[PDB]
């Protein structure tokens, strides 16, 4: 599509915008993040590459918090992800202020997806280069997971995987019984999948980062305790 | 050979999914002199290497002043450094005036990142071409941060930036084990020893091209120049 | 200065002559603010941003300020293409009794003055 790919407001002869395609190709330049929805919660997991030992343990976090009931995992350009996280926090806070109760996840996903899509129409701005997931859990709604695309399209998923190696990650996710497991097994399965998909020659070393939101946390997003993370790492290494 | 059409603007995506102007701006930090920063359980210090154009000139200022508990070091362009310093000073002054409480370093860095991200997405602008090292003290203890032209910040614990900073970074990585249980004299000695690695093995760390900034719990931000750095330098060994 | 402007009293500019003067002078701005606030509270941040971007893009292709313009696309976007108000039939701006120099008004529009 050479000659029709210098602006976000130009159509190719076959009717397609190419800057958006380049933006969606830009997300496969980062590591792999996956998310699995289970019977009574949602479990996240990301593969973080260590740059140096000088950075503090807890820097360049890729698992954010929107409010006391919503998690978020990103992939792609980091600055755009931070800006989108700020926008999501603003939207959720404003909804809580006006209506007096917690915002449903579907409306938040719709608002953020439309805000992302708004950058696809004009030549004075540049499309975003990051894709992310959202998750929550309520007693009367259960687990919920969502996807956002740099083109601005959102969907609900049972299992999702974004990043450099989404194909293989999805291949191993599909052979699981999501609807008949709890978080205790899902965390180990996620660790095993992340260890399986990782490539050793290209990337020197990596450290895991796991989190869930579910019934046992009373619908609050939290970091996995250290002992559970260590035993999951041991299980994944032994199985590998 | 195929880069010609995809690297003149900051609002254009390359077919590989890259923005080349951001990388080109990041290449500008390596045009300045090396600076070194490290911290301990109580104090945070900044060490810079001044450079004069010729003999008949005064070395320019590399360590600036922001607030009673925050100080920065610069490497790269100068107009961008001045603009960022003005923004930081205004933010700190406004927060103090309104809330009667010092602006936290984490909030300051988040504001800096949010401001810097904007000119990398819209037309008619260019990314900032300066990298910063920020040292401060607040209720959570000493802090040290780094800022990138790509609107990214890292909460490091010992970092150096500038031209030929690899040797200093290697020395800091090797000796970071014994930094927490140290006091000011040997902390500054470690900083100076790390900075000395940048120079060729024929020069010396004389008292004419060194600037030191120290902040602490009961000590406000202080800058030592010329004869003021003499007490911090006699104890250094040979190369 | 002092010849390009005159007959202005500072003490007669702080106090409006009639209760309706300010409301009539700034009706469109208040209407836009109300609409944008309601839209932002109902749908989200994106809708007012899109509307303002469209308004800014449309308002940027007109005649130079010393000749009357039609403002067709702006009226289509706003919805004023099928309503007639008192601003249309009273004191027609296409037949104004006073007008300044061309270059001076073009410079004033850019803000160089």
């Amino acid at each position: 599509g050479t000659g029709y790919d210098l602006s976000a407001s130009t159509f190719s002869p076959d009717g397609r915008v190419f800057q958006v395609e380049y933006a969606m190709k830009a997300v496969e330049n980062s590591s792999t993040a996956i998310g699995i929805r289970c019977k009574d919660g949602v479990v996240f997991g990301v593969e973080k590459l260590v740059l140096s030992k000088l950075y503090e343990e807890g820097s360049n976090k890729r698992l954010f918090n929107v409010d006391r009931h919503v998690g978020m995992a990103v992939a792609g350009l980091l600055a755009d992800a931070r800006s989108l996280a700020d926008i999501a926090r603003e939207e959720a806070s404003n909804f809580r202020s006006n209506f007096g109760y917690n915002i449903p996840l579907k409306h938040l996903a719709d608002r953020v997806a439309m805000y992302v899509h708004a950058y696809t129409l004009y030549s004075a701005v540049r499309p975003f280069g990051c894709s992310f997931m959202l998750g929550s859990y309520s007693v009367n709604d259960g687990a919920q997971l969502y996807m956002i695309d740099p083109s601005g399209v959102s969907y609900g998923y049972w299992g999702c995987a974004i990043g450099k190696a989404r194909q293989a990650a999805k291949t191993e996710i599909e052979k699981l019984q999501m609807k008949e497991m709890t978080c205790r097994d899902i965390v180990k399965e996620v660790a095993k999948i992340i260890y399986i998909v990782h490539d050793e020659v290209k990337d020197k070393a990596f450290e895991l980062e796991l989190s869930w939101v579910g019934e046992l946390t009373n619908g609050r997003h939290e970091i996995v305790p250290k002992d559970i993370r260590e035993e999951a790492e041991k299980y994944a290494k032994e199985s590998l | 050979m195929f880069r010609n059409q995809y690297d003149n603007d900051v609002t254009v995506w390359s077919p590989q999914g890259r923005i080349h102007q951001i990388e080109y701006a990041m290449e500008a930090v390596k045009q300045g002199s090396a600076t070194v920063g490290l911290k301990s359980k109580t104090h945070a210090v900044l060490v810079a290497l001044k450079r004069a154009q010729s003999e008949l000139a005064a070395h320019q200022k590399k360590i600036l002043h922001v607030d009673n508990h925050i100080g920065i070091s610069i490497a790269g362009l100068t107009a961008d450094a001045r603009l960022l310093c003005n923004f930081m000073r205004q933010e700190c002054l406004d927060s103090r005036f309104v809330f009667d409480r010092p602006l936290p370093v984490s909030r300051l860095v988040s504001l800096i990142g949010s401001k810097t991200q904007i000119p990398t997405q819209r037309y008619g602008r260019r990314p900032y071409g300066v990298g910063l090292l920020i040292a401060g003290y607040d209720d959570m203890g000493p802090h040290i941060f780094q800022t990138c032209p790509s609107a990214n910040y890292f909460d490091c614990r010992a970092m150096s930036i500038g031209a030929r900073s690899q040797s200093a970074r290697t020395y800091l990585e090797r000796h970071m084990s014994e930094f927490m249980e140290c006091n000011l004299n040997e902390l500054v000695k470690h900083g100076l020893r790390a900075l000395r690695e940048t120079l060729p093995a024929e020069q010396d760390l004389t008292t004419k091209n060194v600037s030191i900034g120290i902040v602490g719990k009961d000590l406000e931000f202080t800058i030592y120049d010329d004869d003021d750095v003499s007490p911090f330098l006699e104890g250094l060994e040979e190369r | 200065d002092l010849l390009r402007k005159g007959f202005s009293c500072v003490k007669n500019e702080l106090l409006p002559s009639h209760p309706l003067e300010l409301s009539e002078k700034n009706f469109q701005l208040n209407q836009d603010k109300m609409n944008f606030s309601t839209l932002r509270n109902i749908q989200g941040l994106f809708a007012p941003l899109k509307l303002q971007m469209e308004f800014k893009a449309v308002q940027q292709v007109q005649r130079l300020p010393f000749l009357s313009s039609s403002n067709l696309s702006l009226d289509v976007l706003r919805g004023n293409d099928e309503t007639i108000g008192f601003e249309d039939i009273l004191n027609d701006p296409s037949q104004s009794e006073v007008m300044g120099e061309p270059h001076l008004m073009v410079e004033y529009k850019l803000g160089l003055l």
Binding site: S83, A118, Y119, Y122, A124, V125, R126 | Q117, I118, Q121, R122, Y123 | L49, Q52, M53, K56
Partner: peptide
């Protein structure tokens, strides 16, 4: 970034 374009 878009809100900065307007004013």
């Amino acid at each position: 970034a878009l809100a900065s374009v307007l004013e």
